[PDB]
Ligand binder design. Structure first.
Ligand SMILES: Cn1c(=O)oc2cc(N)ccc21
Ligand SMILES: [Mg+2]
Lengths: 151, 151
């Protein structure tokens, strides 16, 4: 592997480790990965971090009833750009009616960007991904990894 | 007021807001500010963050029973360099006997560096500072801020 490939795989492993921990504990989480469409306007709504990715930091960010847990983490250029960011709520009538604002925010950003957003449900610990205006629900660990590698 | 001076003031405000919040809630914390003696050897024992400082991130790091809460945060200028770092334990007999490992680690690093370390007791909420081998306990909010401004 090249340095850039090794770095991408390390980031994927850090994300999946954090997501698994949160899914097991039913910790709600919202993590958007910026792609070609710039998301600076949304990054600017949160708390700046520009931090190295680690599973530890991702977990610490989303702990319930803490300063950083409300809102989205946005990743950009292999770093955590900001936490507690605003994302736009989707008005799509085709999202499962049992899902709340975390999932609607993820679908919303996916409607206007090419980003990939991961959501952990605080109700069930279920893991989902929003891309292109669609929500892919009840993902296995393998499925999430496949989506991150495809992305 | 140069940009350097304004950045320092912002960092002091972030630190003091976080410490005050953790003191009120008896959240144990151990926060070392590198000065002229480089602390790379200790930074490298922790989880790298290289993050912009915020009161929110400082608080999120020290929440009990989370990946990052045990060990020291080490700050370099206006960044959180790493969390969950090792510091050496002091054997000084002037550490109150009831105090635990955070205070002994803080005095320990203060014996071999010119750093300033802030400690919040999880037993009492009291705030202390270790510098040059001495521990100063039960600091008021005003005294801590004045110490940081002088540092
Ligand atoms: C480990 N953990 C978790 O899963 O939820 C938490 C909440 C708090 N306040 C502190 C720790 C945890
Ligand atoms: Mg006194």
């Amino acid at each position: 592997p090249t340095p850039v490939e090794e770095a991408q795989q390390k980031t994927i492993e850090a994300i999946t480790k954090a997501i698994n921990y949160m899914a097991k504990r039913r910790i709600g989480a919202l993590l958007t990965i910026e792609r070609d469409t710039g998301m600076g306007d949304y990054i600017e709504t949160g708390i700046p971090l520009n931090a190295k990715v680690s599973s530890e930091l991702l977990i610490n960010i989303f702990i319930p009833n803490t300063p950083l847990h409300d809102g989205a983490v946005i990743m950009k250029n292999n770093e955590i750009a900001a936490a507690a960011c605003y994302l736009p709520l989707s008005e799509s009538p085709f999202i499962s009616k049992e899902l709340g604002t975390r999932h609607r925010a993820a679908v919303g950003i996916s409607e206007v960007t090419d980003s990939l957003t991961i959501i952990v449900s605080e109700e069930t610990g279920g893991v989902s991904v929003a891309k292109n205006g669609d929500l892919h629900r009840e993902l296995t660990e393998e499925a999430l990894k496949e989506m991150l590698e495809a992305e």
